[PDB]
Amino acid sequence: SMDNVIGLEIIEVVEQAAIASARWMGKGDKNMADQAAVDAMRNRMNQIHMRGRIVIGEGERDEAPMLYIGEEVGICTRPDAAQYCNPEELIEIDIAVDPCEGTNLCAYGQPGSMAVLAISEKGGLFAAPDFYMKKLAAPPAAKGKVDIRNSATENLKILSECLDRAIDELVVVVMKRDRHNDLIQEIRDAGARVQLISDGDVSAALACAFSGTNIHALMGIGAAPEGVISAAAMRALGGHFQGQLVYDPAVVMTKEWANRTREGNLEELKKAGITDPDKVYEAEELASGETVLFAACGITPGMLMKGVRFFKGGARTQSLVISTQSKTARFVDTIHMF
Amino acid sequence: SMDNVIGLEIIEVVEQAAIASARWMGKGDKNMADQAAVDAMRNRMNQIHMRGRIVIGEGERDEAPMLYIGEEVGICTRPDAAQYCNPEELIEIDIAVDPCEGTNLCAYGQPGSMAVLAISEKGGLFAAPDFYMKKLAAPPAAKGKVDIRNSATENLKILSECLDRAIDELVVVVMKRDRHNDLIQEIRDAGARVQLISDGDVSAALACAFSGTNIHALMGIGAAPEGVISAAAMRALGGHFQGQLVYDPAVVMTKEWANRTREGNLEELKKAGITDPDKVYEAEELASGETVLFAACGITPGMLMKGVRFFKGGARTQSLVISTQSKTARFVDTIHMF
Amino acid sequence: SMDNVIGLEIIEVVEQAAIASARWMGKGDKNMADQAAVDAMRNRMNQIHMRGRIVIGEGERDEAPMLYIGEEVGICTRPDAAQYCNPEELIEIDIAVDPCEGTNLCAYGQPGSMAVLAISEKGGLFAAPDFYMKKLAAPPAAKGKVDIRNSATENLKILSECLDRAIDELVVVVMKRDRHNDLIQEIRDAGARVQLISDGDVSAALACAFSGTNIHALMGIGAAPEGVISAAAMRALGGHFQGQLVYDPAVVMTKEWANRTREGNLEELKKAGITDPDKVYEAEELASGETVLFAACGITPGMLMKGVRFFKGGARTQSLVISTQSKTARFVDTIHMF
Amino acid sequence: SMDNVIGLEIIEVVEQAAIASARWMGKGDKNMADQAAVDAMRNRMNQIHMRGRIVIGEGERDEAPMLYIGEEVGICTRPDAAQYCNPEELIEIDIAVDPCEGTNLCAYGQPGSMAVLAISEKGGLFAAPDFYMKKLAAPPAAKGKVDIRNSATENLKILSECLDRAIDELVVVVMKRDRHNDLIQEIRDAGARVQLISDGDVSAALACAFSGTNIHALMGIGAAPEGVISAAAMRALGGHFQGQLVYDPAVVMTKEWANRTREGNLEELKKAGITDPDKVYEAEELASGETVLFAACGITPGMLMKGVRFFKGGARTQSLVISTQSKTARFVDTIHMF
Numbered sequence A, B, C, D: 001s002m003d004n005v006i007g008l009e010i011i012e013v014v015e016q017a018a019i020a021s022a023r024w025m026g027k028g029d030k031n032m033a034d035q036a037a038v039d040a041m042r043n044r045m046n047q048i049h050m051r052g053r054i055v056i057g058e059g060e061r062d063e064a065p066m067l068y069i070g071e072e073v074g075i076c077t078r079p080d081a082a083q084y085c086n087p088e089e090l091i092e093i094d095i096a097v098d099p100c101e102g103t104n105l106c107a108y109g110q111p112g113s114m115a116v117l118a119i120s121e122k123g124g125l126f127a128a129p130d131f132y133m134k135k136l137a138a139p140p141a142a143k144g145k146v147d148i149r150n151s152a153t154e155n156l157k158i159l160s161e162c163l164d165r166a167i168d169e170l171v172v173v174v175m176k177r178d179r180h181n182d183l184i185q186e187i188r189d190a191g192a193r194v195q196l197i198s199d200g201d202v203s204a205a206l207a208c209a210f211s212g213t214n215i216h217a218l219m220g221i222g223a224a225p226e227g228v229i230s231a232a233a234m235r236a237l238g239g240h241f242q243g244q245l246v247y248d249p250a251v252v253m254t255k256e257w258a259n260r261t262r263e264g265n266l267e268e269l270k271k272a273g274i275t276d277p278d279k280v281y282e283a284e285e286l287a288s289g290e291t292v293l294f295a296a297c298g299i300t301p302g303m304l305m306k307g308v309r310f311f312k313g314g315a316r317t318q319s320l321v322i323s324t325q326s327k328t329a330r331f332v333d334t335i336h337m338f
């Protein structure tokens, strides 16, 4: 089992990433917001005595200079780590990062943006390809009771019984996208409510795990790697999560896949060594390791954490850190003095 | 001076309006959200022993069946009120309402929606016409120091000195509209931040009055009647507010004014008995009465109040009620049992 | 049914009483703390259009110049009230007050002090004599399941099942008094915890009604009139409360009853028209009216409300107001400007 | 400079100590409450890779089996630490502990109890003898403006100007002890307020450093080692603290010093190598090292942190951790699952 110290240091990782990204809040520059976050997250991780590999991040080493897929992070990745690192610290771990989950939200001062990461031992986090993903997220009472393969209407009926709430008081977060017109209409027809977001379905899935938030499920199609980070959260909190890769451009209806074809995408999946493109992944398959760590820090306001607030001489952050190793859910409000 | 009891009853007015509107949260129906709110606000006001006239509301008596301009509300508007009402309760008062400020926000589960009203004695609230309005809102330290007639860049410079904050840490809420491209760019060029909202500039202006919110000013062009409600808030809290009517379709660039002309609009202003179309209105001119009451209750989450939350058997509301008569700012968290 | 307006005005009654009492916080003068509270509560009640009679208060008209038993309060107690008051406002109501519950706590800066009152229609609040009272208070899950006639050990066993908590994690508030040595020891022997208070068993009983407080029951012997105010709270919140008068000086062991005898006290009870001195009163017997109102405002910090905080130019209060008529539990945080 | 990791691990040290001590909350056993705390604090510290020496603790090695003065704590105190520890981790540091500050408060369910520690590099924390100590604590605005050598009346006058508050709204915490009759009376005579506590003057001094608490100074005579822990807090937060040893039994008036004499105590001070018994120690002299760490976790409720709350399957803690090395003040709310 990995070093317990890591579950503490990641507090500072998401804090520093959030602070740096928040420096570009409402500046209208999604690139600078991402770059500051990515830079601050990496540098803080590279001060941890850990032996880490990025398995979800900014993109392939070609497509992304920093926190690329397969990048080594932590002091103990160094060739002579045996001089600086305990056996414990030498344990290999996989890391999924999203330094600024919802860069558009941070750029235009929109709620829902977070610095987020997940950690497990090697092989313990699914290395999702850069694909879309059908997601179903729901609270702990609903775990294994709802199912991604059910209709939205059936899932709401089940969720209603699980949470002991009328169906017309269930709140489903759905991403505002042309791909979701039918889904959205269905939820309405069922009698439930639809909370539309422009970006940031990770803070959405995470809200499902907590009572107090007025969020009871996430439905629809999001980005796959972000799905894995959400799954890691749910596994740690005992909430429901399932994901299924989406590869057909006719389903997702975006400009990103305007010059993509279903078959071309299928072959890309084969190249990734994915043999079952239609597979439904349980939370325990997406985050499958012995130990799961999850950390988040608010950039703009969300339902669980406030955004970063600056003041003369400093900043104030709110963070959520979850460890299956220490069995703790830890809310952290930090005043940073500059 | 009006009955002190009114400053208490309006707690229940905005609560009931918010609850009713929240029943349509995320239902995708901006009409039902408005109608429930309007209906619940009016009925709760009609149980108050007050002699009220609506001066800002849903529209003219022709254009709006409920809470129309000039509608009488309160038990003491009845012809035989002298049998039911104290002299005190017989005092004539003017009321500005927005039962669901940001109906689109409530319909699609977006932050920033509130049930809101303002009250003063007769003649004490400007009866704004259904026009656009250039608005400048800012915290109490900035009152009378910034000015609507200044450039955004000069106003930020001044605001910087007032709040003792670097300019690059000032947050200006601006409505996302084509009319604001130049304004938005200017604020960026100045070095400050722009928080874009899709609707709801009343909760924006109100956030300016409170430290803790990360909102330091509102700039740009909004709707005039909503401006008056915001001015009433600021006058009560001692925050800055100024408004100036906008009448030229080339400036506002909307489909609502696509078949409108500058001159046609100017003549409409004359018909309203407005002789100076270019007048800058101080907060004290928009809300000019001896006594000002202001009440708000969150429908969806904002920076000051949570949205309405429903649970098995009830709902929970958060409200803000301000009285220059009792000199109180009153935050109210209510659990309603059904 | 009484005027709904009263359930709003009492917010201001407990606020004003608390503020006035808080002016003597930590001044070491339990008399001034009481007198300011009593004075401020009465004056604010005398501005309500209600027809009230004090049935629990500072003492008999001889023993207490202000808020004495049988004193008339409210504008509609006046002989010519028919000129000022609606039929509704003319309804007769009984009021129980404790303007400063725990004057010693306020005098020495101790937690647990509150301004508190309860209202019902005439005959609806038991007019307890100035006697001690065995009390059992417990949360809603425990209502009618525990019983004052059971041993503390049996009641803890039952409470354990009701709240789904180990017995060694139940917290019983008990007053630190020689009369409770055996009771206290019993609770320990049972395995549970004892939270000792020096004064103020009303805020204790009220804490039992709320999850979040770490208080799960009140046991032991307190003052009877304060018991009735607590019962009114519980009936409104659906929590458990029972009371039984204690009249035997050998049981209570105080200096107040050093020159009292069991038989002399029994005869005093007869004079009050109490025929069953050993009667166990249900919550519904102590507060038996159709409508129950309950209001509290913190003077020093408690588990539900902060104490009054003063600042340059004003004060900040926190209040709890409960109405079976509007079916609302209402937490109120007020900033008062002077 | 010491390992930054230590400023994170101490979060868990005070949490574990608090949880263990809270298991005896309201059990009436000040010994078990202390022993659980002491045991849990030591064991959690002995899992940190640090090279620590206890300089303030349970007592001398003879008088106290656990966390005694001079005890080595941390993995890097081991003779072969060079095999397990970085140079950084091998740095010598001094630690002051109070695993349960106010054991009486925890035993009887009283507010004000905390698990607390302070850390600096070797020589950086004054090794106070087991003596009483005159203390003056006050907020940052008052730092170096008030003075322990002034009368309480002069200090209040100065504090009044510093905080911009009327003197009659200043709150001085003073310990309820016969030794303080004259002090207490003086503060009243000055016009200010006295908040009496039975134990726990560390949480009192710490409250002075924060606005929001209604505590503006600590005055009077407390225990010396606890004074040093408080000084460490103030130095980190920039609040005022001064201490002066009290050695004369006629001044302190306790049973602990009933068979002590002034001269006997003076000679004890000489044996400790203290040459100036009348010395006034600045905060920077009591906590004089380059780096200061301070950690606290609530056991029973205080003004900054809630006490430990238990629930079916776990506990919830609130902690405050301050580091001059990371320049952070960090509030931590942790849900522990068992």
Ligand SMILES: O=P(O)(O)OC[C@@H]1O[C@](O)(CO)[C@@H](O)[C@H](O)[C@@H]1O
Pocket: A101, A102, A103, A175, A177, A198, A199, A200, A201, A202, A221, A222, A223, A224, A226, A227, A254, A256
């Ligand atoms: O290609 P589109 O239509 O934008 O959808 C991808 C979106 O990217 C985010 O919103 C942000 O990275 C992310 O939170 C979601 O996973 C979402 O699906």
Ligand SMILES: O=P(O)(O)OC[C@@H]1O[C@](O)(CO)[C@@H](O)[C@H](O)[C@@H]1O
Pocket: B101, B102, B103, B175, B177, B198, B199, B200, B201, B202, B221, B222, B223, B224, B226, B227, B254, B256
């Ligand atoms: O005509 P558009 O371009 O929509 O602008 C009017 C908008 O209406 C609201 O957003 C909502 O009623 C309101 O909060 C604002 O005043 C705003 O200006």
Ligand SMILES: O=P(O)(O)OC[C@@H]1O[C@](O)(CO)[C@@H](O)[C@H](O)[C@@H]1O
Pocket: C101, C102, C103, C175, C177, C198, C199, C200, C201, C202, C221, C222, C223, C224, C226, C227, C254, C256
């Ligand atoms: O006669 P004692 O031994 O003091 O007991 C009476 C006490 O009075 C209060 O503590 C305060 O009025 C009150 O909250 C309680 O009812 C308590 O019993």
Ligand SMILES: O=P(O)(O)OC[C@@H]1O[C@](O)(CO)[C@@H](O)[C@H](O)[C@@H]1O
Pocket: D101, D102, D103, D175, D177, D198, D199, D200, D201, D202, D221, D222, D223, D224, D226, D227, D254, D256
């Ligand atoms: O000898 P007494 O009269 O008890 O005074 C010592 C007290 O011990 C504590 O209250 C608790 O350890 C501690 O918080 C204080 O320092 C206090 O002075």
Ligand SMILES: [Mg+2]
Pocket: A034, A057, A058
């Ligand atoms: Mg990216």
Ligand SMILES: [Mg+2]
Pocket: A098, A100, A101, A102, A226
């Ligand atoms: Mg991403």
Ligand SMILES: [Mg+2]
Pocket: none
């Ligand atoms: Mg996108």
Ligand SMILES: [Mg+2]
Pocket: B034, B057, B058
């Ligand atoms: Mg409308």
Ligand SMILES: [Mg+2]
Pocket: B098, B100, B101, B102, B226
């Ligand atoms: Mg409107």
Ligand SMILES: [Mg+2]
Pocket: none
């Ligand atoms: Mg519009």
Ligand SMILES: [Mg+2]
Pocket: C034, C057, C058
């Ligand atoms: Mg009394």
Ligand SMILES: [Mg+2]
Pocket: C098, C100, C101, C102, C226
């Ligand atoms: Mg009393």
Ligand SMILES: [Mg+2]
Pocket: none
């Ligand atoms: Mg007494």
Ligand SMILES: [Mg+2]
Pocket: D034, D057, D058
């Ligand atoms: Mg000890």
Ligand SMILES: [Mg+2]
Pocket: D098, D100, D101, D102, D226
């Ligand atoms: Mg101690």
Ligand SMILES: [Mg+2]
Pocket: none
């Ligand atoms: Mg002692």
